[PDB]
RNA sequence: AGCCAGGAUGUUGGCUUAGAAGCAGCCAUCAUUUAAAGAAAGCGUAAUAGCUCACUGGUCGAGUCGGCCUGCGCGGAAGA
């Protein structure tokens, strides 16, 4: 339950689709007094991760720039018909 | 055959079936028949696919129908010229965008829930898929 | 001892001599006649009990008659007079039909030991108890 | 078949029986009858109880993996079907002959009754045992 | 045989074969289950 | 992949006695002998019998399945 993830730089419709058509997908980490953090991460991992019921309950440690941030999945966007994720909201 | 019990207006415009669906998550039951394709389901098709599920799983289990028509479709009689009024309402349809869960089952095995939805999917025009009630 | 020459068994309650509607054709399907299963069949039916199904081997030969040795009546047909209810199964888990304890079935188990095959008495005990388990008789252990 | 652990359990169970044992006997029912099955194993009940595991699994590497650790002469017995009937009470019991005696009493054949290991011998019908 | 556009495995012994471009379903038990095309 | 290989005695068990009887309709879904076997997944029966599938298995010898995600193709595909 540990995933490496990159920091986003371009963010919008155009970037997110380019990203989402490259085996990755956008997510966001937020919580506490700190600012939110936009987080690009790989699809094929997190797709296999969510099959387990622990994923949507237990604490996940997301690795960003070396730093491991502790979070829980608060919300998630499925793709309308295809079995694949679009976006995840990680509460801290 | 499903149909609205009374309506504000008898006849409705054609409109356009665009965008993505809204009833995407499997809400009530365990399993569900999701519409991959785009189109419109007549009142007859829904009943025909319901009968095909209901009779496959027998008395046991429970079924939901998430789609309901509420859109009247007019049709002009044979050998009648154009104009001279909007045609008469023949049948009723439900507009189906991609993602829409049509049916949902509960209280049955996973292997025997699929076999039932194939028989339903065979009745429908739209290309469909099987979906399970996930968390979140 | 010979292999499968033919001998298949199949008969009703031993008291009912010369069965034509129950067995009939299958009794004298081979060269063995119908009349013998009446004189010779009731030779060892009268010793134990009548109104009871008891199996016998039917090793037919080219002579005329057949050699035979008997065995033992079935589990459930014994568990009508012994159990109490003439019926047995029907709807066991949905609706428990009856019940029997270990003390009766353990005692009834060892009386068939001439036919029954096993290591100890307690071995066959739980089997011959077991035969109750699916007549809606969840064993009262 | 189940995991490496489940199969290791079965062999490691068989190896512990050889540690607390002595005499053994082969048996091969090429044309077996389930009435015979309850004579040579019924015997085991007449001895005492369940412990006498016949264990018919002499595959070139299955029960012969336990061979290297316990009694190396049984590797040559591997060819053709064989069952390693391990004993427990009584040193050199009467369970060896009964397989040969049952073979006559309606059992078709019995591996040519070759035997296992007490003086490291081959096919010998031996009435000379402690009784 | 049948020349249906949706051939499929009917019984256990039915077997799918691609002969000369065409997909066939040859069977051992019932010669009825023999079927071409699709 | 094959493959001499096992895959039970009572269960005609009860229940609508026209038999349902491992495989039509009512649930149970025994436990023994055990290297194993569900009182049964399918075929076959007026029902049996008899073939098997899960499975103990005896061999050969290490890669095998069944789904997803799919980019190209295939059939479906008959007119003057
Ligand atoms: Mg409009
Ligand atoms: Mg809409
Ligand atoms: Mg909504
Ligand atoms: Mg007019
Ligand atoms: Mg040709
Ligand atoms: Mg594959
Ligand atoms: Mg294609
Ligand atoms: Mg043509």
Ordered by where they begin, the domains of chain B are 21-136 (3.90.1170.10)
Chain B within 8 Å of A50 (Cβ-Cβ)?
A: yes
Candidates D81, D79, D80, D86; CA nearest to D117 is D86
Q: Does residue C38 share a domain with residue C78?
A: no
Is the CB of A80 less than 8 angstroms away from the CB of B21? yes
C122 and C81 in a common domain: yes
C4: closest chain D residue by CA:
D33
Whether B135 sits inside 8 A of A78 (CB atoms) is no
* Whether the Cβ atoms of residue C69 and residue C59 lie closer than 8 Å to each other: no
Instruction: Tell me: do C63 and C92 sit in the same domain.
Output: no
Helical axes C102-110 vs C121-133, angle rounded to 10°: 120
Burial C10-29 (b: 16+ CB within 10 A, else e): ebebbebeebeeebeeebee
Taking CA C78 as the corner, what is the angle to CA C72 and CA C81, rounded to the nearest 5 degrees? 145
How far is residue B35's CA from residue B31's CA, in Å, rounded to a whole number?
13
Q: Which two tokens stand for residue E37?
A: 């095309």
Joined tokens for residue B96: 């189906």
CA atoms within 13 A on the CB side of D129: 18
Query: Are D45 and C119 an interchain contact pair (Cβ–Cβ within 8 Å)?
Result: yes
Domains held by chain C: number: 2
Of C71, C86, C118, the residue that ends a domain is: C71
Rounded Cα distance between B57 and B73, Å, is 32
Question: Domain check: are C41 and C94 in the same one?
Answer: no
Residues C80 and C130 in one domain: yes
User: DSSP letter string over B91-124?
Assistant: EEEEEE-TT-EEEEEESS-HHHHHHHHHHHHHH-
Cβ of D14: how many Cβ atoms within 10 Å? 19
Instruction: Please tell me which of the candidates B24, B134, B135 has its beta carbon nearest to residue A80.
Output: B24
- Whole-number CA gyration radius for chain C: 18
- Residue in this structure with the two tokens 């019932």, named with its chain if needed: E30
**C95 and C63 within one domain:** no
**Nucleotide with smallest C1' distance to residue D63 CA:** F35
- C83 and C141, same domain (yes or no): yes
The residues, any chain, with a CB within 8 Å of residue D79's CB and separated by 6 or more, are none
Burial (Cβ within 10 Å: 0-12, 13-18, ≥19) of residue C47: exposed
Residues C15 and C44 in one domain: yes
Chain A contact for B24, CB < 8 A? Answer: yes
CATH code for the domain in which residue C3 is found: 3.30.1550.10
Chains B and A touch (3+ CB pairs under 8 A): yes
Q: Residue D44 in contact with residue C119, Cβ under 8 Å? A: yes
The domain boundary, picked from C71, C90, C125, lies at C71
Expressed in angstroms and rounded, the spacing between residue E38 Cα and the centre of ligand 7 is 14
Indicate which technique resolved this structure: cryo-EM
Distance from CA of A77 to the nearest CA of B (A): 9
Around D18, how many Cα atoms within 13 Å sit in the side-chain half-sphere? 21
Q: Are residues C53 and C118 in the same domain?
A: no
Last residue of a domain, one of C71, C95, C119: C71
Length of chain C: 141
SS3 content of chain D, % helix, strand, coil (to 5): 35, 0, 65
Is C50 found in the same domain as C81? Answer: no
Domain carrying residue C32? 1-71
CB contact under 8 A, B34 and A50: no
What are the backbone angles phi and psi of residue B90, rounded to the nearest 5°? -95, -55
Of D58, D65, D73, the closest CA to residue D111 belongs to D58
Residues of chain C contacting D45 with CB distance shorter than 8 Å? 118-120, 123
User: Where do breaks (C to N over 2.5 Å) occur in chain E, by preceding residue number?
Assistant: none
Interatomic CA distance for residues B102 and B35, integer angstroms:
7
Interface test with B, best of A80, A84, A90 (most B CBs within 10 A): A80
Residues C14 and C30 in one domain: yes
Q: Do C32 and C94 belong together in one domain?
A: no
A91 neighbors B32 (Cβ within 8 angstroms):
no
CA E27 to ligand 8 centroid distance, Å: 26
């Amino acid at each position: 339950f540990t995933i490496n993830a990159e920091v986003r730089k371009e963010q919008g419709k155009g970037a997110s689709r380019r990203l989402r058509a490259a085996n990755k997908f956008p997510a966001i980490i937020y919580g506490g007094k700190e600012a939110p953090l936009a987080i690009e991460l790989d699809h094929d991992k997190v797709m296999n991760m969510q099959a387990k019921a622990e994923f949507y309950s237990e604490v996940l440690t997301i690795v960003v720039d070396g730093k491991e941030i502790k979070v829980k999945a608060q919300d998630v966007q499925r793709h309308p018909y295809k079995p694949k994720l679009q976006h995840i909201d990680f509460v801290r | 055959m499903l149909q609205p019990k009374r309506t504000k207006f008898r006849k409705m415009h054609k409109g356009r079936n665009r965008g993505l669906a809204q009833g995407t998550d499997v809400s009530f039951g365990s399993f569900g028949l999701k519409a991959v394709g785009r189109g419109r389901l007549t009142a007859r098709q829904i009943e025909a696919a319901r009968r095909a599920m209901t009779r496959a799983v027998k008395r046991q289990g429970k079924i939901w129908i998430r789609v309901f028509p509420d859109k009247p479709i007019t049709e002009k009689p044979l050998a009648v010229r154009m104009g001279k009024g909007k045609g008469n309402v023949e049948y009723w349809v439900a507009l189906i965008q991609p993602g829409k869960v049509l049916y949902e089952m509960d209280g049955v095995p996973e292997e025997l829930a699929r076999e039932a939805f194939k028989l339903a999917a065979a009745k429908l025009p739209i290309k469909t898929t099987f979906v399970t009630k996930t968390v979140m | 001892a010979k292999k499968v020459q033919a001998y298949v068994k199949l008969q009703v309650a031993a008291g009912m001599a010369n069965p034509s509607p129950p067995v009939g054709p299958a009794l004298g399907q081979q060269g063995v006649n119908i009349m013998e299963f009446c004189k010779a069949f009731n030779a060892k039916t009268d010793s134990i009990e009548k109104g009871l199904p008891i199996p016998v081997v039917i090793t037919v030969y080219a002579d005329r008659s057949f050699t035979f040795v008997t065995k033992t009546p079935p589990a459930a047909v014994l568990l009508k007079k012994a159990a109490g209810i003439k019926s047995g199964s029907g709807k066991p888990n949905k609706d428990k039909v009856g019940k029997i304890s270990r003390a009766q079935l353990q005692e009834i188990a060892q009386t068939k030991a001439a036919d029954m095959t096993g290591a100890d008495i307690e071995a066959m005990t739980r089997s011959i108890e077991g035969t109750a388990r699916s007549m809606g008789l969840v064993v009262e252990d | 078949m189940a995991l490496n652990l489940q199969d290791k359990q079965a062999i490691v169970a068989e190896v512990s029986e050889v540690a607390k044992g002595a005499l053994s006997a082969v048996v091969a029912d090429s044309r077996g009858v389930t009435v015979d099955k309850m004579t040579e194993l019924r015997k085991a009940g007449r001895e005492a109880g369940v412990y006498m595991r016949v264990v018919r699994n002499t595959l070139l590497r299955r029960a012969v993996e336990g061979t290297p650790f316990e009694c190396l002469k049984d590797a040559f017995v591997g060819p053709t079907l064989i069952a390693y009937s391990m004993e427990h009470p009584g040193a050199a019991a009467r369970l060896f002959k009964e397989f040969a005696k049952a073979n006559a009493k309606f059992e078709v054949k019995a591996a040519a009754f070759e035997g296992e290991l007490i003086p490291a011998s081959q096919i010998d019908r031996l009435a000379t045992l402690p009784t | 045989m049948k020349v249906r556009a949706s051939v499929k495995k009917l019984c256990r012994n039915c077997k799918i074969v691609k002969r000369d471009g065409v997909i066939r379903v040859i069977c051992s038990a019932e010669p009825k289950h023999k079927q071409r095309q699709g």
